Design a protein around this ligand. Structure first.
Ligand SMILES: *[C@@H]1O[C@H](CO)[C@@H](O[C@@H]2O[C@H](CO)[C@@H](O)[C@H](O)[C@H]2NC(C)=O)[C@H](O)[C@H]1NC(C)=O
Ligand SMILES: *[C@@H]1O[C@H](CO)[C@@H](O[C@@H]2O[C@H](CO)[C@@H](O)[C@H](O)[C@H]2NC(C)=O)[C@H](O)[C@H]1NC(C)=O
Ligand SMILES: *[C@@H]1O[C@H](CO)[C@@H](O)[C@H](O)[C@H]1NC(C)=O
Ligand SMILES: *[C@@H]1O[C@H](CO)[C@@H](O)[C@H](O)[C@H]1NC(C)=O
Ligand SMILES: *[C@@H]1O[C@H](CO)[C@@H](O)[C@H](O)[C@H]1NC(C)=O
Ligand SMILES: *[C@@H]1O[C@H](CO)[C@@H](O)[C@H](O)[C@H]1NC(C)=O
Ligand SMILES: *[C@@H]1O[C@H](CO)[C@@H](O)[C@H](O)[C@H]1NC(C)=O
Ligand SMILES: *[C@@H]1O[C@H](CO)[C@@H](O)[C@H](O)[C@H]1NC(C)=O
Ligand SMILES: [Zn+2]
Ligand SMILES: [Zn+2]
Lengths: 497, 497
């Protein structure tokens, strides 16, 4: 008889469950006594919300649309703890989508020579024109200063601007109920802001706001995708990508000199995968040059824009292999978005295969990765972190209930993962706290606590592209922040026994 | 590493080929005729996926069954799967596996059938030979009278069907939460309970399961049944052994009539809402029926909604009782387990207990991909997972079926059988709808006839037939398969004339 007594059965059961706990993200962390006090509180709070949803037969709010869950999570202790927690790094961000729309309205649209129009889809667009009103080809441009002053209600005018640009004005899962409809709205958002956010002094100040906002959410480091190109002055001068990089380098250096508690930022050049192979070839050659001349600030290259309907990595493969085929070879790092899809066995999810054959340093999303066991082996073996952006994947159509997020089985296998926010400004998310809350409540289990959070935070620095010296310094800083956070939390939640 | 495209191509195809060999069916070698059909299926699959992907429209095989049912039935892939022999349906509930149309057109035309509108405004049906039933919470009326006075009998009969089926409206819209749709599902069983437990109707309903499954080219079924409480017009209530004998006699007559049908076996099910003291008696009952009906009675299962009700651990002394006897008794178990979106809770840890108790097959295992050690145990022991994709969508575990959690199981060749669960409740065919959605949503664009063939063979190889029965059934399946291949080449004009 295998299990003659309850003790024989529970021994076997607990060993099996415990063995799985040891294998998931964070499973090897040993919390100290102060961390354990906070962990026990976090776990009591987590069990209360889950058991209420399960036994009282009501929806699990952390997993529903961000439109519905945002205001509900923000009043809760677990969210308030994650808000205070140091996050380490946000490694997957886009530079035109990472600061508040409120700042675009309250700051940028109060500058001279900003114009607005309603396009033929009934969306507001914003741009800058130094010479005069822009040509009235597809819409009638009007000076924002005049429209605001004539609105008869300035606060309502500004709120309307914000409402007409944000993807969280209504629930995207209701208003744009298909992949194509919501990506239509997402694409439109960037068209709405493109003119104003490419004007050089606004773009400079917007990048500074990214750093300020991320610091204010207790993020100490960011790596940012940027096209770098086409920043334009009031007189019409258009700058090249190297200028865009130098501009970001100077903002970043000023910021880190102001805030020693902040580790800094580095940049990845992104190009939209709707362009011909000759454009990607030129941007690859550009990236080779910037990688050589800005070591330690310019990281490498990525291809962006919607993955499903546009060009695969294989479609650009001669361009992407060009660095490695030089004599001597040139090693241009790649940070490919890859597998941001529900498709299986197609040109889209097979981008994961090409991303690994091209030696990607990290991969963006990897939503399809759990369908590719041989790619998982390579990702684990090589230490290629997967940048998981859970709110983005829900709102942009890959999943509805976030407990079905395809990164939950990755985390259960200890695939290297970092959490990030992707385009938080587009849908009114915080730099990291909302995405970290939904990862913690939806993508790991009821009995997963502070150890998961600590591991994800440490991962974001460990799998950053900092050099060894920078990384050692950043981890010492993170450890200090973490200690202060534990001590402060014990006092705040009245856990000091 | 890749000086030319040929070297890059070779590495890419080696990695993709490794994944294709690993997944379900990857080791099958198709013959020349099967390859011709395979090439047509793959051409059809690529055309529909590429149209969805490149023309930016929804992928109909993955949307709500309410919307996709009428669309898939006109397509060649569906028609091929319809004609295909399925082998076995191994996961079925006996009060939910024949057509509601038969309940209406046959059962509700029988003498002594009554109907009433309950307090939730649903029709309920029952039989009473000894006068009309007492007006306890509803007012019973003879159906024969209600029908004859309707003024439109076609509309009356259609109203009955529409008031009972869960596919009258889209459940994802009408009942848009787990608790709401399970409320509707539970209500469906309440609507039919009275009529479907009347002995001659139950007998004839079970015969209709066999007729309908045979007509969808299924040759064998294993069926969960509560067995107990069938009642006669004079009020006699029968015991579970009688219910088992009733099904045994129907099955034997069916196989005499149709030697091209392999037959059926029965699993006793009990609802997991009962006190542990009552489950103990159902385990003892199952031990006795297993001893005395070897080869027809298979074992035991616990059913009803998994999330809010009792876990396997809550019944553990009852479930361990057979193994603890002197001498031990090996009562086989077929546990529904992990039919849930929860992680790290009592519900998904039912999978651990299912394995410790040596389950022969596991029902659903939706949460299994979150449990890497349980997966390895399932693979090494050959415990088949019964995957019921339409059920999991309509009853609230997933919306886009390409997010179904069995797709990563099939990619690692976890042993899986496809089944339909409760097809009569939502107007599905015995197997062809579930096999179509598994084929179109749970494996990739490059997965063809080898996946179908493997899942069909799996349904016999992981059945509970003894070894001699399996060999007989596989010879019968092979002949059906060969006829299906030849017929398909002629029907789809593939013979290369
Ligand atoms: C962007 O703003 C426009 C202009 O206000 C909105 O269009 C209006 O939408 C309302 C609904 O509240 C319609 O009844 C009106 O007819 C529209 N007015 C005009 C002048 O066209 C539009 O809905 C906003 N779009 C978004 C996504 O918020
Ligand atoms: C089952 O049948 C009842 C009775 O016909 C339906 O009741 C009707 O419900 C609609 C609302 O959807 C009302 O407008 C009607 O007045 C109701 N009629 C009566 C006589 O009450 C009920 O909707 C049906 N339920 C389902 C799920 O189909
Ligand atoms: C269910 O809700 C009630 C209040 O409506 C509360 O008393 C009870 O604790 C809840 N159960 C759980 C497990 O949260
Ligand atoms: C906008 O930000 C710039 C740069 O920080 C600042 O100088 C200016 O005062 C701001 N405008 C408003 C209206 O606050
Ligand atoms: C990828 O990395 C390996 C090991 O460092 C190297 O030998 C190979 O050339 C690289 N391949 C490419 C395509 O850069
Ligand atoms: C997209 O639709 C057009 C017009 O119906 C059709 O010609 C084209 O072949 C479709 N594309 C694909 C890839 O199916
Ligand atoms: C119902 O089925 C029974 C038993 O198979 C059959 O004898 C009877 O004719 C059927 N009733 C109708 C209305 O078809
Ligand atoms: C499970 O099976 C093993 C191997 O057949 C056997 O030794 C063991 O006693 C069984 N356990 C239970 C709980 O029935
Ligand atoms: Zn991104
Ligand atoms: Zn079932």
């Amino acid at each position: 008889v295998r299990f003659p007594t309850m003790d024989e059965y529970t021994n076997a059961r607990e060993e099996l469950i415990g063995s799985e706990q040891y294998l998931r993200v964070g499973g090897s962390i040993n919390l100290n006594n102060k961390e354990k006090k906070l962990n026990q509180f976090i776990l009591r709070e987590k069990r209360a919300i889950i058991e209420n949803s399960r036994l009282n037969k009501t929806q699990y709010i952390p997993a529903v649309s961000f439109f519905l869950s945002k205001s509900q999570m923000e009043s809760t202790p677990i969210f308030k703890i994650i808000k205070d927690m140091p996050k380490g790094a946000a490694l997957h961000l886009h530079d035109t989508a990472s600061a508040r729309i409120d700042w675009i309205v309250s700051n940028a649209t109060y500058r001279d020579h900003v114009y607005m129009c309603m396009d033929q889809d009934n969306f507001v667009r914003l741009t800058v024109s130094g010479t005069g009103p822009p040509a009235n080809s597809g819409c009638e441009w009007k000076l924002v200063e005049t429209e605001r002053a004539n609105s008869g209600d300035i606060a309502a005018f500004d709120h309307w601007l914000k409402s007409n640009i944000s993807l969280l004005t209504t629930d995207p899962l209701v208003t744009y109920p298909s992949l194509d409809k919501v990506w239509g709205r997402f694409d439109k958002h960037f068209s709405q802001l493109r003119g104003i956010i490419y004007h050089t002094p606004i773009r400079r100040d917007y990048y500074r706001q990214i750093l300020e906002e991320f610091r204010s959410d207790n993020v100490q480091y960011v790596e940012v995708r940027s096209s770098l190109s086409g920043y334009y002055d009031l007189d019409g001068t258009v700058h090249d990508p190297e200028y865009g990089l130098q501009l970001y380098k100077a903002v970043t250096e000023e910021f880190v000199r102001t805030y020693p508690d902040f580790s800094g930022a580095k940049i990845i050049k992104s190009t939209a995968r709707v362009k011909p192979n000759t454009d990607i070839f030129n941007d690859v050659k550009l990236s080779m040059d910037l990688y050589k001349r800005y070591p330690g600030f310019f990281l490498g290259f990525d291809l962006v824009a919607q993955e499903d309907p546009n060009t695969s990595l294989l479609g650009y493969i001669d361009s992407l292999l060009y660095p490695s085929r030089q004599n001597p070879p040139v090693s241009l790092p790649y940070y490919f978005h890859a597998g941001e899809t529900n498709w299986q066995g197609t040109e889209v999810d097979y981008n994961l295969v090409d991303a690994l054959l091209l030696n990607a340093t990290r991969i963006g999303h990897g939503f399809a990765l759990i369908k590719h066991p041989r790619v998982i082996e390579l990702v684990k073996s090589r230490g290629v972190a997967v940048e998981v952006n859970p709110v983005s994947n829900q709102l942009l159509g890959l999943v509805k209930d976030l407990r079905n997020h395809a990164a939950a089985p990755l985390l259960a296998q200890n695939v290297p993962v970092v959490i990030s926010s992707d385009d938080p400004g587009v849908w009114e998310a915080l730099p990291m706290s909302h995405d970290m809350y939904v990862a913690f409540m939806d993508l790991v289990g009821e009995d997963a606590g502070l150890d998961v959070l600590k591991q994800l935070v440490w991962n974001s620095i460990q799998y950053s592209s900092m050099n060894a010296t920078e990384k050692k310094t950043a981890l010492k800083l993170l450890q200090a922040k973490w200690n202060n956070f534990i001590n402060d939390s014990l006092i705040k939640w009245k856990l000091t026994n």
